[PDB]
Short mmCIF file of N, CA and C in Angstrom, two decimals:
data_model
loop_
_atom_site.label_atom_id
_atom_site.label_comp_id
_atom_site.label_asym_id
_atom_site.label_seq_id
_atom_site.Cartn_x
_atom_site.Cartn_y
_atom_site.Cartn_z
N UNK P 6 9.39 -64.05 -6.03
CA UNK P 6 8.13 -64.30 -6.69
C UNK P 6 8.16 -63.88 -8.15
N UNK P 7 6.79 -64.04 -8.81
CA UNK P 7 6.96 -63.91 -10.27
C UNK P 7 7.49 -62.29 -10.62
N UNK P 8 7.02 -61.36 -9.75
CA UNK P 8 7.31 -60.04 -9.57
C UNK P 8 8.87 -59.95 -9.60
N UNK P 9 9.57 -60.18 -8.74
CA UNK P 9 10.80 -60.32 -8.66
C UNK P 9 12.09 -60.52 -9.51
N UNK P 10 11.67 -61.94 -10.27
CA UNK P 10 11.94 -62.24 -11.73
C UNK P 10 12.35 -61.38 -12.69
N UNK P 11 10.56 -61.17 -12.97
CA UNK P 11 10.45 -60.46 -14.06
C UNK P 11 11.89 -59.00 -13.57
N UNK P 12 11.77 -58.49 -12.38
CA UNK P 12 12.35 -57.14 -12.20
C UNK P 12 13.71 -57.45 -12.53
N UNK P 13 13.92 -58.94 -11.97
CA UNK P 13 15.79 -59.76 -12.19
C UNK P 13 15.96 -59.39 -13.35
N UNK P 14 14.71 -60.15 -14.52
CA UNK P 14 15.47 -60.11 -15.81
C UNK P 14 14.89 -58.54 -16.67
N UNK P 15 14.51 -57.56 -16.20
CA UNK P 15 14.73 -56.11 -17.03
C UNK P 15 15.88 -55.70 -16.53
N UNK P 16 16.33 -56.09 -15.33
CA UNK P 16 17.73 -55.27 -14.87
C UNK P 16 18.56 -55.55 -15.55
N UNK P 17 18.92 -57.25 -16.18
CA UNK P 17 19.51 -57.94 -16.92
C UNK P 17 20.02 -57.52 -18.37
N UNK P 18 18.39 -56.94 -18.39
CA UNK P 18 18.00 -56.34 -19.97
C UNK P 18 18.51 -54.89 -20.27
N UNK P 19 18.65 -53.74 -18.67
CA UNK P 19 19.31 -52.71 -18.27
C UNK P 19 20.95 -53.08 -18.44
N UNK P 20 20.93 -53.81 -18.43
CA UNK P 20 23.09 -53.93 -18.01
C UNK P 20 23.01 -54.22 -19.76
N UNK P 21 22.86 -55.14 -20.31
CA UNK P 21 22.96 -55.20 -21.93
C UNK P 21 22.49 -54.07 -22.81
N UNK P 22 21.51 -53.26 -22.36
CA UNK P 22 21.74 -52.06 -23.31
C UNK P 22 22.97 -50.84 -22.30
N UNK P 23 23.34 -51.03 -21.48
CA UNK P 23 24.60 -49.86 -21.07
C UNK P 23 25.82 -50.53 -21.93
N UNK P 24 25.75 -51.76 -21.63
CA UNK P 24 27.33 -52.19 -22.44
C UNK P 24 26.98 -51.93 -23.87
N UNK P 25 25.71 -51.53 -24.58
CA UNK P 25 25.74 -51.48 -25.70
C UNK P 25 25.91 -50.09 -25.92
N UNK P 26 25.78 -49.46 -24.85
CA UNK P 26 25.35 -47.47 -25.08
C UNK P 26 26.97 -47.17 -25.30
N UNK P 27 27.34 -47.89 -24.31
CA UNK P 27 29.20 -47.00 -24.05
C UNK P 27 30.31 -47.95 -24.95
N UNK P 28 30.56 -49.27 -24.26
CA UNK P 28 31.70 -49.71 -25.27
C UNK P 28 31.16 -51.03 -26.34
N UNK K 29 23.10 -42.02 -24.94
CA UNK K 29 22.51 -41.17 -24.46
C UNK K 29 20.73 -42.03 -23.97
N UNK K 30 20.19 -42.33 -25.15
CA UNK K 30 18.59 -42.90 -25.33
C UNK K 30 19.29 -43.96 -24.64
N UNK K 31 19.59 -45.06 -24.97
CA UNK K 31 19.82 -46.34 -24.46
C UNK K 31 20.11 -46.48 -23.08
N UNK K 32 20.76 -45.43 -22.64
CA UNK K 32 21.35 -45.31 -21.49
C UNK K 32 20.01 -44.93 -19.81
N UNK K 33 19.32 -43.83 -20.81
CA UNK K 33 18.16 -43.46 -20.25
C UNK K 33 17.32 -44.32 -20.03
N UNK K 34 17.41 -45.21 -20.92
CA UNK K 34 16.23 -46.22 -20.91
C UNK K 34 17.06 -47.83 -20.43
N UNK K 35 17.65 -47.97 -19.71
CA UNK K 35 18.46 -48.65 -18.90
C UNK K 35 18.10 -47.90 -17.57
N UNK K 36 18.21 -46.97 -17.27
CA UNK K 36 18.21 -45.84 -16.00
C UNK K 36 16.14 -46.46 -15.44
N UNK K 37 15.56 -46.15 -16.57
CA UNK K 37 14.02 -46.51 -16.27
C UNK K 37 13.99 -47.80 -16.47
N UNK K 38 14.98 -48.68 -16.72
CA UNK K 38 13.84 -49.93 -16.92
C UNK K 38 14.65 -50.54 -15.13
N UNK K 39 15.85 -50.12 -14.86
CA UNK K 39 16.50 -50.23 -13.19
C UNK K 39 14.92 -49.51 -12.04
N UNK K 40 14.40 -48.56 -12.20
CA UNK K 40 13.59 -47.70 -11.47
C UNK K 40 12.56 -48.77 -11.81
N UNK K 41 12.43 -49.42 -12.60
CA UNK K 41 10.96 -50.16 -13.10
C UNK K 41 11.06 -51.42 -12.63
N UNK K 42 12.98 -51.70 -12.43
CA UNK K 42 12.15 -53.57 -12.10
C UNK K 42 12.53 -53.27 -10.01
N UNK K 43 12.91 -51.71 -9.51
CA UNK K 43 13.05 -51.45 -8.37
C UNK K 43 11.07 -51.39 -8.12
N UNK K 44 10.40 -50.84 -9.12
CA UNK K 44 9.07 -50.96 -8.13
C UNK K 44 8.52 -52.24 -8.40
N UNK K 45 8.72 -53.01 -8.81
CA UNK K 45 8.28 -54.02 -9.31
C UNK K 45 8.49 -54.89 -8.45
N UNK K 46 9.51 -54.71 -7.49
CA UNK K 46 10.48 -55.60 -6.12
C UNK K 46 9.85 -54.77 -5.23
N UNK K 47 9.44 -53.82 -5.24
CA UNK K 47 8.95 -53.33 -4.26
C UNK K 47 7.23 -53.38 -3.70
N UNK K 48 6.39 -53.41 -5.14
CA UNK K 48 4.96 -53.86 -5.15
C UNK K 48 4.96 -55.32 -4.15
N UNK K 49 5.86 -56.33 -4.66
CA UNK K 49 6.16 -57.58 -3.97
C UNK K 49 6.75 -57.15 -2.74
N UNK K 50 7.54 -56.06 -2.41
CA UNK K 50 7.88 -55.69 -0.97
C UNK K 50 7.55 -54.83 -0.43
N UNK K 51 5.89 -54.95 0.31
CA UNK K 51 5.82 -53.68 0.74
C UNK K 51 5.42 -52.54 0.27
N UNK S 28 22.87 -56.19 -33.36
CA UNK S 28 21.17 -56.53 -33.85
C UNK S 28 20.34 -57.04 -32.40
N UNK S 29 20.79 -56.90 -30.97
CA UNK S 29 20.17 -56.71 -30.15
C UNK S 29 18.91 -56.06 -29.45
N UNK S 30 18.64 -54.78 -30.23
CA UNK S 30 17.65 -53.77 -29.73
C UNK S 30 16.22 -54.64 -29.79
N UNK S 31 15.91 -55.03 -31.26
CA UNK S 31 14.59 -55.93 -31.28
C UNK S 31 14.19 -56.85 -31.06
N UNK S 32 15.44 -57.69 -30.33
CA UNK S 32 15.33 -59.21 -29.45
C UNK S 32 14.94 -58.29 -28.42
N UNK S 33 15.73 -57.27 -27.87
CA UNK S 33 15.12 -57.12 -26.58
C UNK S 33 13.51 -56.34 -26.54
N UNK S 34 13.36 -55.39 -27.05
CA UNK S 34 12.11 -54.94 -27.47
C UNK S 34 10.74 -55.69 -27.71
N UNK S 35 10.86 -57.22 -28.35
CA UNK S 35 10.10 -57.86 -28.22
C UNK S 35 9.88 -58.78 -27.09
N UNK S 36 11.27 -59.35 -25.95
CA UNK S 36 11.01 -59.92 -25.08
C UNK S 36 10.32 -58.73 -23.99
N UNK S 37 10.30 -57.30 -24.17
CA UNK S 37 9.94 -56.44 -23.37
C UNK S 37 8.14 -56.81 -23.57
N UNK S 38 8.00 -56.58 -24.52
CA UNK S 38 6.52 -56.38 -24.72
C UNK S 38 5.89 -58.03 -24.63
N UNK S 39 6.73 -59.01 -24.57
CA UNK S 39 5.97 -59.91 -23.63
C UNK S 39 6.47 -59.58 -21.99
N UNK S 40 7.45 -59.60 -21.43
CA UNK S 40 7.03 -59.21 -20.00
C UNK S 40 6.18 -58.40 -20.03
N UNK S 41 5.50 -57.20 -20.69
CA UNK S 41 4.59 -56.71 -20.03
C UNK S 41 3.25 -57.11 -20.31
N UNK S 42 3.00 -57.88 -21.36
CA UNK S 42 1.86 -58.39 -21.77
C UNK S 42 1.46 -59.54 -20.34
N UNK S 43 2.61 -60.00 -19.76
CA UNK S 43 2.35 -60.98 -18.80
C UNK S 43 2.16 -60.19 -17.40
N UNK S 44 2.66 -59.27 -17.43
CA UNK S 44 2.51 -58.25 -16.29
C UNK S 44 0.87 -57.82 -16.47
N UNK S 45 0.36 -57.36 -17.80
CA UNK S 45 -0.66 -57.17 -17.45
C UNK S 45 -1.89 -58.08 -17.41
N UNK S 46 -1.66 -59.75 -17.51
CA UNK S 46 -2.34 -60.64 -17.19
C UNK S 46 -2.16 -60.68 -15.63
N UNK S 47 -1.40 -60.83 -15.08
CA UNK S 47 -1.01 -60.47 -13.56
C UNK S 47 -1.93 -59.39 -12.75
N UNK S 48 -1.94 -58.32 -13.67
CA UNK S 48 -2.83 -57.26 -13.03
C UNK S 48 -4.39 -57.61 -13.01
N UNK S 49 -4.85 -58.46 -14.16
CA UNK S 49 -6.32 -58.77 -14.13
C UNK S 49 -6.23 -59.80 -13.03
N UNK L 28 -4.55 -50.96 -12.36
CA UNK L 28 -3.32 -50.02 -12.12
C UNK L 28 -1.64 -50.26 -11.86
N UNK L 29 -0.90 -50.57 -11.07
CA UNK L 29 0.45 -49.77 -10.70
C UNK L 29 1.06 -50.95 -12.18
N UNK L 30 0.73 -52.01 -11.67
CA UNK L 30 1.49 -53.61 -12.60
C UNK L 30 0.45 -52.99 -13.89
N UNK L 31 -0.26 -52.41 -14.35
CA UNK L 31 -0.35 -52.25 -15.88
C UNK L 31 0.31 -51.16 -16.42
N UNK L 32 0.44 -49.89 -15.43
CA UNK L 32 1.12 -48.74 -15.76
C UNK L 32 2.34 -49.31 -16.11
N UNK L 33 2.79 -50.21 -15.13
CA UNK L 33 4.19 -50.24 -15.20
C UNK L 33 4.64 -51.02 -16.95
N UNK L 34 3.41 -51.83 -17.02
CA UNK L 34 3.03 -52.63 -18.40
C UNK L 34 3.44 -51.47 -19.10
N UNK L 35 2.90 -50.65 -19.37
CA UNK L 35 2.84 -49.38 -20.40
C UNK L 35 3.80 -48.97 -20.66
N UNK L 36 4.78 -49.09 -19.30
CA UNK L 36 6.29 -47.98 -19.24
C UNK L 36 6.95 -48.90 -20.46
N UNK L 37 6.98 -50.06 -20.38
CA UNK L 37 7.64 -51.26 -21.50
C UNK L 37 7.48 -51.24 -22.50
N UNK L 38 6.07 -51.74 -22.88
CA UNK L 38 5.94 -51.29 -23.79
C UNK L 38 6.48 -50.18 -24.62
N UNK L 39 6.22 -48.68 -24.27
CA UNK L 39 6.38 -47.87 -24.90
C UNK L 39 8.33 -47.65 -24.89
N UNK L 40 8.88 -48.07 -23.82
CA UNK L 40 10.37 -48.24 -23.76
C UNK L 40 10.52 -49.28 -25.20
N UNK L 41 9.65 -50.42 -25.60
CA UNK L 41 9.45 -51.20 -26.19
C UNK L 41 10.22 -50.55 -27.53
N UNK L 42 8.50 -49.50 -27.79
CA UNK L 42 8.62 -49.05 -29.25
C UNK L 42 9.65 -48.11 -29.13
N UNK L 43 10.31 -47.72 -28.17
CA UNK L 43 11.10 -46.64 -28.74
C UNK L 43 12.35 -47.32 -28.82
N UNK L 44 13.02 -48.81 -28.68
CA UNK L 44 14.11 -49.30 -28.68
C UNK L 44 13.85 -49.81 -30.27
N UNK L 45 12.53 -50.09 -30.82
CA UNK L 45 12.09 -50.48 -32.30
C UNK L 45 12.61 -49.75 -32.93
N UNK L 46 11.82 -48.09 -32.63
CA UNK L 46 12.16 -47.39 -33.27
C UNK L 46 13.81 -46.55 -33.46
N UNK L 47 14.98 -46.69 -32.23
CA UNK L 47 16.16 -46.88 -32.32
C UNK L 47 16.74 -47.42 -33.32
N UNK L 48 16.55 -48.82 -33.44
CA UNK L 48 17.17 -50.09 -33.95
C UNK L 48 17.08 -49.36 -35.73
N UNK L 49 15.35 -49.46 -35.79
CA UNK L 49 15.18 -49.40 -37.19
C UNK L 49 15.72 -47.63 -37.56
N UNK L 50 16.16 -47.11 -36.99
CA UNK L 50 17.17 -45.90 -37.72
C UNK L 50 16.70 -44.34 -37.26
#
């Protein structure tokens, strides 16, 4: 659902700032 | 360190967010 | 130059999150 | 409540990735 999504794409948004924190 | 943290909360944020929709 | 692409797509998911809530 | 709080958490994750970026 729209809930779901949205949670898909902050996790999305979580993995692109770690690859930005470390390498 | 910041970036990393805030990767850590936005994972916990789109987990309740899947979870409001589940339950 | 990533941080403020994402920062601004943040503050529309939540702007739409909180149309959701009304 | 829970879906606006959670609004808030972003947001303010928001400004503090602004305020990162810009120095």
């Amino acid at each position: 659902g729209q809930l779901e999504e949205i949670a898909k794409q902050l996790e999305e948004i979580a993995w692109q700032l770690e690859e930005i924190a470390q390498g | 360190g910041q970036l990393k943290k805030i990767a850590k909360q936005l994972k916990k944020i789109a987990y309740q967010l899947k979870k409001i929709a589940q339950g």
